[PDB]
Ligand binder design. Structure first.
Ligand SMILES: Nc1nc2c(ncn2[C@@H]2O[C@H](COP(=O)(O)OP(=O)(O)O)[C@@H](O)[C@H]2O)c(=O)[nH]1
Ligand SMILES: [Mg+2]
Length: 353
């Protein structure tokens, strides 16, 4: 059938969500090449009490010292599949759903999302269900038309991370190097939502070498950017929409610590604010127009359930395309081979042996 999306259908007790465990990780380098190590992981290095508070020029180095990752390249699940292949002997996988954390984020935010539609392609292969986002025609059009100032704004986000990160534990941030968005660190995580086992990985911003719990993902820190705010209305508006995204993104991998840099009209970060992941909901708890963690999760569970029961055939060439648009239900279409098939032959053959 189709799956309804509205929040009042998914109120009720917070579902079972197993505390995420890191099964491993991988890194992408300056030219988007996979390495099965943590080389790209950077280390949390906030401004000390000793010296000045933050005064970070997010415009510095734009565009000369900016090497943006090529966005035309469809990567699908490839990097994760490689990790999965290199670790096949860790039958749990057969019952798992496999994705990127980001895809799960969009499921979590669906009941409250007013603008951004999405498309998830789904193939079952050896029991395992694989989900992989397809960029909607609308979203592609917006990406190809990205205005100069929106391109700079993306840079500034990654630039903020450079002021807050050191290459080594207890090191100093070097805000004069290149920002290269091909370079990423990813944690590979195991969880279970309800009775749906999960294998997913997400981009991790940095490690806090001063977190008393030295074990991932507890020791990770997410670094965020947003417009400076003044009126209560701007804060309320931030809590209701943006905070929801931040919560979903870091809750899934079990990242407890989020730091926000608020940027000037002149493009400087003159204040920081820490949002512990577990505290984010307190900002909207009494808000009649707020979001609810268990609405996000109950919908997400219902979607997984829906996808599991819909995708019956075990076939790597077969795709059930799940589509969603704000103010509508999740609908399904069936497709075979190109252009929607996403599991590469090199993976299918090798997992078959
Ligand atoms: N090309 C491309 N890669 C992405 C994008 N978003 C995430 N990735 C990559 O996909 C992997 C998982 O990302 P994920 O955690 O799901 O993204 P996020 O939660 O939206 O920040 C990482 O290796 C990222 O570098 C994107 O919009 N374009
Ligand atoms: Mg971030």
């Amino acid at each position: 059938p189709s799956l309804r999306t509205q929040p009042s259908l998914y109120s009720g007790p917070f579902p079972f969500y197993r505390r995420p465990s890191e099964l491993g990780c991988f890194s992408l380098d300056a030219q988007r090449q996979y390495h099965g190590d943590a080389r790209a992981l950077r280390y949390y290095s906030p401004p000390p009490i000793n010296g000045p508070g933050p005064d970070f020029d997010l415009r510095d180095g734009y565009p000369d010292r900016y090497q943006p990752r090529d966005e035309e390249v469809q990567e699908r699940l490839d990097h994760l599949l490689r990790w999965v292949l290199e670790h096949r002997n860790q039958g749990w996988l057969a019952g798992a759903t496999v994705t990127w954390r980001g895809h799960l984020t969009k499921l979590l935010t669906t009941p409250y999302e007013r603008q951004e539609g999405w498309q998830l392609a789904a193939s079952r292969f050896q029991g395992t269900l694989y989900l992989s986002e397809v960029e909607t025609p609308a979203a592609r059009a917006q990406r190809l038309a990205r205005p100069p100032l929106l391109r700079e704004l993306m840079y500034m986000g990654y630039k903020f991370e450079q002021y807050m990160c050191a290459d080594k534990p207890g090191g100093s941030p070097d805000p004069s190097g290149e920002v290269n968005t091909n370079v990423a660190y990813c944690s590979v995580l195991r969880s279970r939502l309800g009775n749906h086992p999960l294998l997913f990985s997400g981009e991790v911003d940095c490690l806090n070498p001063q977190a008393p719990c030295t074990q991932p993902p507890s020791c990770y820190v997410e670094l965020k950017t947003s417009k400076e705010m003044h009126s209560p209305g701007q804060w309320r508006s931030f809590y209701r929409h943006k905070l929801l995204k931040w919560w979903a993104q870091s809750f899934l991998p079990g990242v407890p610590h989020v730091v926000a840099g608020f940027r000037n009209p002149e493009g400087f970060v003159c204040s920081l604010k820490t949002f512990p992941t577990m505290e984010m909901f307190e900002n909207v708890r009494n808000d009649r127009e707020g979001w609810n963690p268990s609405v996000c999760m109950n919908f997400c569970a219902a979607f997984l359930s829906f996808a599991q029961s819909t995708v019956v055939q075990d076939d790597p060439r077969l795709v059930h395309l799940f589509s969603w648009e704000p103010g509508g239900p999740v609908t399904v279409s069936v497709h075979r081979d190109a252009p929607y098939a996403f599991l590469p032959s090199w993976y299918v053959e090798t997992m078959t042996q």
